[PDB]
Amino acid sequence: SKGEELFTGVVPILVELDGDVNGHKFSVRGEGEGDATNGKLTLKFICTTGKLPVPWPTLVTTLVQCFSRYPDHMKRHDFFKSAMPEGYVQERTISFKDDGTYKTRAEVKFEGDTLVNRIELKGIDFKEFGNILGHKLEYNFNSHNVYITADKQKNGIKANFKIRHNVEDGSVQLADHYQQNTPIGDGPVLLPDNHYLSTQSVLSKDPNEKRDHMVLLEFVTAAGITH
Ligand code: NA
Structure with missing residues (x-):
């Protein structure tokens, strides 16, 4: 396919995020490469404004699902690559349980030969002494399933999933993710059957x-549709 042909090799990646969490203004820049054939990406991110005011793990999901490895029998359900090169808008609400909320808006698209993820993030109602602004989260990231369903009205997809962040006192900090993706092109895009992405970081x-x-090292494979 057109979109999927862009990902047959190793693709350079650029990520730019501007964030505002309880009035903390920060920026992150990431660079690296993705290898969708193997579902693998490698990236290094830098807070360009000084100290990151939230824990790095809380930004992992915001900081390119077009690099998922879709098995051959599922390539019909890969919305993300089918929106390329024009790209898609990815929006999320991330509700940290008993704490604040991130709202994110991103565009993922090719800029020349580079796959670019440009993000605006706004966080409100965070606890200044909670797990996020308090930096109480372990520096790691557990494996999750991202459940994808079509959104025929918006010619896109929706996704829902719960992230679990290990807190350093042994407890666990829930972050409920609600996600909507809309193509930027006018071209046709693949609308998938229900399925999920299995991610490891x-x-x-x-x-x-x-x-x-x-x-960050990430490995993602799609699944949930029977061969
Ligand atoms: Na381009």
């Missing part, structure tokens, strides 16, 4: 990096 640090940063 590894967070690390670059020892020679003095800025506040996150190295």
Whole structure:
């Protein structure tokens, strides 16, 4: 297909986020590459405004599902690649249980040969001494299933899923994700049957990096439709 042909090789990635959480203004820039054939991406993110005012794990889902490995028998259900190169808008509400809410708006699209994710994030009602603004979250990220359903009215998809962040006192911080994706092109796009993405992530640090940063390794495969 047109869209899927853009992802047969290794694709450079750029991520830019401007965020405002309880009045904290911050920016993040990420760079790396994605290999959708193997469902794998490698990225390094840097807070370009100084210290990140929220924990890095809380931004992982906001910081390119077009790099998911869709098995051959499922390629008919890969909305994300089918919207390319024109791209799609990805919007989310992320409700941290007993805490504040992120609202995000992003565009994911090709800018030349680079796949770019540009994000605006607004967070309100966060607890200044809670798990997020208090930086009480472990520096890791557990495996999740993202459940995707078509949204024929918007010619796009919706997704719902619950992220679980390990709190350093042993408890767990829930973050309910509500997600809507709309194509930017006028071209036709694949609308999928119900299915899910299975995601696994590894967070690390670059020892020679003095800025506040996150190295991210991610592995995503699609599933939920019988061969
Ligand atoms: Na372009």
